[PDB]
Amino acid sequence: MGVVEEAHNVKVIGSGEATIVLGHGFGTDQSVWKHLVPHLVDDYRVVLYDNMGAGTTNPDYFDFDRYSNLEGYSFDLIAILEDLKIESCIFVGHSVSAMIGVLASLNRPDLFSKIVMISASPRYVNDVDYQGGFEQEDLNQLFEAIRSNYKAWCLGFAPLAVGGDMDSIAVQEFSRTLFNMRPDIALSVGQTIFQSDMRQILPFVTVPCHILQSVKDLAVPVVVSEYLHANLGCESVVEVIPSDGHLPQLSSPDSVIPVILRHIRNDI
């Protein structure tokens, strides 16, 4: 394939035009979708890709200036869609990829028929009129642990993000992909994500959004899903899943995959 697609480990499964594009969150890669993809390929052409800076990507390609804001990732997404000649897709975005897809849709609404968000937030930091789940001091605390001992940080962070028991296979897999990131890139990307603020742009969104999350997610209070629904300019729906974890499609597929599929396959 072309350099852009190779650099993002792009996979295209199937032919035709009905197309779904799946974007992953911080610390993981396209493998996060391993329990969803089997249920899509009979009906849709499926496109997987990795975000620049994931451990599966070449660190020489990580441009710190380009990726200092989420727009860099949104332009990567649009580039891939253009290179593949995709004229319309359903975009499924996990965590930060939800907002990356939203930003892409503001520049190129024509490329997206709908967005399905899994574990999305427009803002992680609290203020006097907004609950995001983190005080700035909590985030200050986390930037420090990455610098001193990256391995320790990964082993402590993975259980909190994934939930469930700490020696579950899912926690181990995430700790592995998380540790595969170069520490300086993990820190830079972490800062960019946790300090982002997409709240102000939500009213400009026009592509319909399906807002899905676990009822227990350390990074996404349930009120965030309500905030998204109330402030997005587009038609939207919310479904909070009786699941635990920030990567619930990976760690609780039996309860989570059916929900995601219903929102992919059915329109508002």
- Structural domain boundaries in the chain: 1-268
Out of 29, 246, 251, 263, which one is annotated catalytic?
246
DSSP state of 125: B
229 annotated active-site: no
116 contacts: CB under 8 Å, gap ≥ 6: 90, 91, 92, 93, 209, 210, 212, 260, 263, 264
268 contacts: CB under 8 Å, gap ≥ 6: 208, 210, 235, 236, 237
Quick one: which of 53, 66, 59 has its CA closest to 26?
A: 53
Token code pair at residue 53: 């800076």
129 annotated active-site: no
Method: X-ray
Out of 8, 24, 74, 95, which one is annotated catalytic?
95
- Cα separation, 6 vs 57, in Å, equals 9
- Cα separation, 32 vs 98, in Å, equals 14
Residue 95 contacts residue 246 (beta carbons within 8 Å):
yes
**Beta pairing class for 11-13 and 45-48:** antiparallel
DSSP state of 216: E
Residue 116 contacts residue 44 (beta carbons within 8 Å):
no
- Cα separation, 238 vs 230, in Å, equals 10
**Sign of the CA dihedral running 68, 98, 5, 60:** positive
Class of 1-268 in CATH = alpha beta
121 annotated active-site: no
